[PDB]
Design a protein around this nucleic acid. Structure first.
Ligand SMILES: [Mg+2]
Ligand SMILES: [Mg+2]
Ligand SMILES: [Mg+2]
Ligand SMILES: [Mg+2]
Ligand SMILES: [Mg+2]
Ligand SMILES: [Mg+2]
Ligand SMILES: [Mg+2]
Ligand SMILES: [Mg+2]
Ligand SMILES: [Mg+2]
Ligand SMILES: [Mg+2]
Ligand SMILES: [Mg+2]
Ligand SMILES: [Mg+2]
Ligand SMILES: [Mg+2]
Ligand SMILES: [Mg+2]
Ligand SMILES: [Mg+2]
Ligand SMILES: [Mg+2]
Ligand SMILES: [Mg+2]
Ligand SMILES: [Mg+2]
Ligand SMILES: [Mg+2]
Ligand SMILES: [Mg+2]
Ligand SMILES: [Mg+2]
Ligand SMILES: [Mg+2]
Ligand SMILES: [Mg+2]
Ligand SMILES: [Mg+2]
Ligand SMILES: [Mg+2]
Ligand SMILES: [Mg+2]
Ligand SMILES: [Mg+2]
Ligand SMILES: [Mg+2]
Ligand SMILES: [Mg+2]
Ligand SMILES: [Mg+2]
Ligand SMILES: [Mg+2]
Ligand SMILES: [Mg+2]
Ligand SMILES: [Mg+2]
Ligand SMILES: [Mg+2]
Ligand SMILES: [Mg+2]
Ligand SMILES: [Mg+2]
Ligand SMILES: [Mg+2]
Ligand SMILES: [Mg+2]
Ligand SMILES: [Mg+2]
Ligand SMILES: [Mg+2]
Ligand SMILES: [Mg+2]
Ligand SMILES: [Mg+2]
Ligand SMILES: [Mg+2]
Ligand SMILES: [Mg+2]
Ligand SMILES: [Mg+2]
Ligand SMILES: [Mg+2]
Ligand SMILES: [Mg+2]
Ligand SMILES: [Mg+2]
Ligand SMILES: [Mg+2]
Ligand SMILES: [Mg+2]
Ligand SMILES: [Mg+2]
Ligand SMILES: [Mg+2]
Ligand SMILES: [Mg+2]
Ligand SMILES: [Mg+2]
Ligand SMILES: [Mg+2]
Ligand SMILES: [Mg+2]
Ligand SMILES: [Mg+2]
Ligand SMILES: [Mg+2]
Ligand SMILES: [Mg+2]
Ligand SMILES: [Mg+2]
Ligand SMILES: [Mg+2]
Ligand SMILES: [Mg+2]
Ligand SMILES: [Mg+2]
Ligand SMILES: [Mg+2]
Ligand SMILES: [Mg+2]
Ligand SMILES: [Mg+2]
Ligand SMILES: [Mg+2]
Ligand SMILES: [Mg+2]
Ligand SMILES: [Mg+2]
Lengths: 22, 46, 271, 94
RNA sequence: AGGACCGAACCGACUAAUGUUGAAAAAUUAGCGGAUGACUUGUGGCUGGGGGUGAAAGGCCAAUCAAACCGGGAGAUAGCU
RNA sequence: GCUCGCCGGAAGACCAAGGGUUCCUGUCCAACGUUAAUCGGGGCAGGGUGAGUCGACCCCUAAGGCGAGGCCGAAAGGCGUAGUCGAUGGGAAACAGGUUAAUAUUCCUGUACUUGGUGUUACUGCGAAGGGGGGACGGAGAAGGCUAUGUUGGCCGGGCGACGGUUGUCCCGGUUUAAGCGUGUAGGCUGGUUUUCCAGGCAAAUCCGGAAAAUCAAGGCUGAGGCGUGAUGACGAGGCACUACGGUGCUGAAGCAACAAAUGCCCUGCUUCCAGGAAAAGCCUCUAAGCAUCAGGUAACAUCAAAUCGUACCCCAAACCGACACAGGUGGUCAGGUAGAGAAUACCAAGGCGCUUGAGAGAACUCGGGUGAAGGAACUAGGCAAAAUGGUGCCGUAACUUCGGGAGAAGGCACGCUGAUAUGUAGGUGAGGUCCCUCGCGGAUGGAGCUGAAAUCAGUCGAAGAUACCAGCUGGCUGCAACUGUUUAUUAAAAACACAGCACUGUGCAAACACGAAAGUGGACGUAUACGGUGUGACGCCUGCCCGGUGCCGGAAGGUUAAUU
């Protein structure tokens, strides 16, 4: 047989505003 | 969670279907575009 | 009358109902009813053209005479009924030849008396006769403006309007808001005030009756965000501009009557 | 009355099955396979004047065909109306 | 009689641990509030983007919103990388 | 195949909107199942849905949509009239049993029902795009009779119990039977009937509505359930047998009573409150344009007919939406026993599944959990967490107030089991038998049987008697908003917002204002005790000074000035 090659999830910009430096 | 799309054909095929897109004006400017590429699944009739 | 209720709950502390016990329960006399549901202020074109209207209970528009077309003939009243649409109480009447109509209740109309719509009418609270033939000083409600259009003057639940003088084919009307309006002699009229005059004593009491009556919660200004109303925002409670409507017109005293059309009838406005 | 030209087109074949091989004897019924524009008139007049035999009453349904995959590309077999035809008391086909 | 109380289904999302390339791109567990009403809900019709709708948070209008998304002038332009 | 686990208002059955061969056998293992694989919702081959009654289509309308004309707009188009479209609602019908490996209210015996044209039988006012009665309607609680089911007894069949008893007051199993057709029922509704009249219902009306007059005690409507009939049939505990030992064929008794009882029926009813609770058609009915002794009309019955399409399968899921066989998300239908108030929860049945990686050892540590010497908040931002309280009956219960609450305030006591009051009463149901009866599904009447709490008193047992599950932490002094509510789906429920009450101001109805350039449309089929705009937010006491800035209101002698000239 064969198969596809998935990609490109909605990666949520990989972060919140975690580094609160103020 | 209730998702993005909870199906109901009884409204889907009258709010997207062929006679709906033939009744207005610019639906005849989408049916006048899908044949340029020549869509074999022309619209959302099953 | 003004029946008070007691603190049995949160909320139910400031209610006062008005009971006129002569009003019958049962059913409204069916062949003068039709259907008029509410569009919540939404016009035909889909937007909102008057705000805060939506919700409430399903109401049926009683066909009401505002013409009293059957002149000359006599009639007697049959019943008094609770109107759903206007705040007044309506009177289910019996014409002598067999029809039934619905007349707004004069303050003396107990269940059982008689009315004589016509130019030959008695001077009693309940009659109807054109305005050549009212003797002046009288208390007249249900007043038209044109010879047969329909009554649009003093038609509310507690109003009444005075005839003050005459001049020729014109007669001078002191309305409830106190605007002297000259009007033609043929415009239809009645005698006495209207019935449920203690309606302005009734207070609502809780938010429930506001939603039942139909009025939605009106959003006040100064807490709205400053894009969607000109009383906008500001981190805190700041207001210091001029008080305006949502569409730029300032409100508190600014005239927005925008006619030069019915100047030649209006004598003088109020204070 | 249906004309003979329209009558003669309405059949393809009888239909072999286990439920045919039970309905043949234990309830004496036959299993047609008719064209898609066939009503109970176009089979009640069609079992009669094509085998010169009689009929009690007719029944049908619209079988929807399966989904086949020849090679790797999809395929949809043609639908076909299956007719159940009950024969009267004292009847026997050829 | 009750925007009355206690408490189910149903809603709702307050507290805490777990879970955070988890089972789930917002949830499990254990406690919680409303629970004959300004409720909740089935299905169906209506509201178009400087517009709608909004108990009005600048929240929501298909997981995207201080102007949705799909083509186009688009090879916008970038004196900065 | 046997144990053992677990759900059982779900993890059960049937369907909905959804999906498109997943259902059933014959195979087949490469890929697919977070493994192996004979197995699979996987490939491959075949088999599988049946109707006058269920549903769609169809007859009729709501919200809206389309909308010739017409009105309006640079054009497309925009609303909008007559119409014709528009289910989630209104209108014909029917059920019980058997069957296949799969469907079946659809197939089969059984027995019923409707709706259309027909031909005849006697009857001879039908006629309508029109007239009226109807369909026809909200919310709450409260009862009254009732069954679906449940329990027990009587009965019938089997068994005398692997180990102390267990031919007895013992144990098991079963005891079901429908629509339809007559029965007019507990009750609910409402006074009927002709005589003549009549500014009315668009015209006419023999129909409504109204005016009388006579005249009667009674006309129907409306209906759940139970009995009848459906019923010699079907099923039916199980025995009777061979075969493909999977199945199936052939037989078959009892089929009663009482009490309990709904969130299901009457009920679309009643009472009563205010926020005052669709239309149209099928139908009932009256008439004109039209009529002819015709036609049509219901009074009969032999008929003839009543399509097309959906029908398999899963349906709170491994089959839908979430990219996955994912602790997720969705609506309606039916609720079994036992303690409880109960659809909660607990253990169970009928049915279902035991969760697609499993074995082994028992480290730190993580998570979910049980208990703890002594001390009790010392911990810490803060009692966050955990613990603890928890149920009814009865006693008892403050300052404070708008008199309602606070309050379930606080704190207490009682309770398991057996026997007696009473061999199970107080309470209900209620046949025996008279009794009268307008004789019926009637009652006057009476107690058999049946079920039936708590109480009290005595005794006994436990460390512990609401023992498990279940099931409020409570007071004290405070800010803040009156509160019930609701919002940042996906970090913020708050002191935010919103509310009723008030104050102003606008608005004379072609309103005022808003969307649309307009047509119109809302406001409103409303009329200043109404609507819009803004301000603050219940009530309680209260709301003082200033018109210079700023705006708004009126006033117009002068200064000031366009387009024109
Ligand atoms: Mg649309
Ligand atoms: Mg307002
Ligand atoms: Mg207000
Ligand atoms: Mg602005
Ligand atoms: Mg400030
Ligand atoms: Mg919420
Ligand atoms: Mg929160
Ligand atoms: Mg939870
Ligand atoms: Mg509650
Ligand atoms: Mg409550
Ligand atoms: Mg805000
Ligand atoms: Mg903001
Ligand atoms: Mg969004
Ligand atoms: Mg934009
Ligand atoms: Mg833009
Ligand atoms: Mg260009
Ligand atoms: Mg570029
Ligand atoms: Mg269990
Ligand atoms: Mg299931
Ligand atoms: Mg397949
Ligand atoms: Mg299979
Ligand atoms: Mg595998
Ligand atoms: Mg292997
Ligand atoms: Mg298999
Ligand atoms: Mg398969
Ligand atoms: Mg069929
Ligand atoms: Mg059949
Ligand atoms: Mg319409
Ligand atoms: Mg249109
Ligand atoms: Mg046109
Ligand atoms: Mg139609
Ligand atoms: Mg429907
Ligand atoms: Mg319908
Ligand atoms: Mg039908
Ligand atoms: Mg099946
Ligand atoms: Mg009619
Ligand atoms: Mg009700
Ligand atoms: Mg029963
Ligand atoms: Mg029974
Ligand atoms: Mg033994
Ligand atoms: Mg022994
Ligand atoms: Mg029966
Ligand atoms: Mg099925
Ligand atoms: Mg799932
Ligand atoms: Mg996902
Ligand atoms: Mg139970
Ligand atoms: Mg449970
Ligand atoms: Mg699994
Ligand atoms: Mg361990
Ligand atoms: Mg512990
Ligand atoms: Mg121990
Ligand atoms: Mg300790
Ligand atoms: Mg200790
Ligand atoms: Mg400390
Ligand atoms: Mg410390
Ligand atoms: Mg401290
Ligand atoms: Mg805590
Ligand atoms: Mg605990
Ligand atoms: Mg402070
Ligand atoms: Mg608050
Ligand atoms: Mg304040
Ligand atoms: Mg709250
Ligand atoms: Mg909300
Ligand atoms: Mg958040
Ligand atoms: Mg507000
Ligand atoms: Mg405020
Ligand atoms: Mg001034
Ligand atoms: Mg000023
Ligand atoms: Mg001025």
């Amino acid at each position: 047989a064969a198969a596809a090659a998935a990609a490109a999830a909605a990666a949520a910009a990989a972060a919140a505003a975690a580094a609160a430096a103020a | 969670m209730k998702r993005t799309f909870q199906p109901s054909v009884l409204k889907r095929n009258r709010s997207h279907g062929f006679r709906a897109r033939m009744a207005t004006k610019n639906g005849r400017q989408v049916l006048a575009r899908r044949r340029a590429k020549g869509r074999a699944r022309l619209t959302v009739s099953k | 009358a003004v029946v008070k209720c007691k603190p049995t709950s949160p909320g139910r502390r400031h209610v006062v109902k008005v009971v006129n016990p002569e009003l019958h329960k049962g059913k409204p006399f069916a062949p003068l009813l039709e259907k008029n549901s509410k569009s919540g202020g939404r016009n035909n074109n889909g937007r909102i053209t008057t705000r805060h209207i939506g919700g409430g209970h399903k109401q049926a528009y009683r066909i009401v005479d505002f013409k009293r077309n059957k002149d000359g003939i006599p009639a007697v009243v049959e019943r008094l009924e609770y109107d759903p649409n206007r705040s007044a109480n309506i009177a289910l009447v019996l014409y002598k030849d067999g029809e039934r109509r619905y007349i707004l209740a004069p303050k003396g109309l107990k269940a059982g008396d008689q009315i004589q719509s016509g130019v030959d009418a008695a001077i009693k609270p309940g009659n109807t006769l054109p305005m050549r033939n009212i003797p002046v000083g009288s208390t007249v409600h249900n007043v038209e403006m044109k010879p047969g259009k329909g009554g649009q003057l003093a038609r509310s639940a507690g109003t009444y309007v005075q005839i003050v003088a005459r001049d020729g084919a014109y007669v001078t009307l002191r309305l409830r808001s106190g605007e002297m309006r000259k009007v033609e002699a043929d415009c239809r009229a009645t005698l006495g005030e209207v019935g449920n005059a203690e309606h302005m004593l009734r207070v609502l009491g809780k938010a429930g009756a506001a939603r039942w009556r139909g009025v939605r919660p009106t959003v006040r200004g100064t807490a709205m965000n400053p894009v969607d109303h000109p009383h906008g925002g500001g981190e805190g409670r700041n207001f210091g501009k001029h008080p305006v409507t949502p569409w730029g017109v300032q409100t508190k005293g600014k005239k927005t009557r925008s006619n030069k059309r019915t100047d030649k009838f209006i004598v003088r406005r109020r204070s | 009355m249906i004309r003979e030209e329209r009558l003669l087109k309405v059949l393809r074949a009888p239909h072999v099955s286990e439920k045919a091989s039970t309905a043949m004897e234990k309830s004496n019924t036959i299993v047609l396979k008719v064209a898609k524009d066939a009503t109970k008139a176009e089979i009640k007049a069609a079992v009669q004047k094509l085998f010169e035999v009689e009929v009690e009453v007719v029944n049908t349904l619209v079988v929807k065909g399966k989904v086949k995959r020849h090679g790797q590309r999809i395929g949809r077999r043609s639908d076909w109306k299956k007719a159940y035809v009950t024969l009267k008391e004292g009847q026997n086909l050829d």
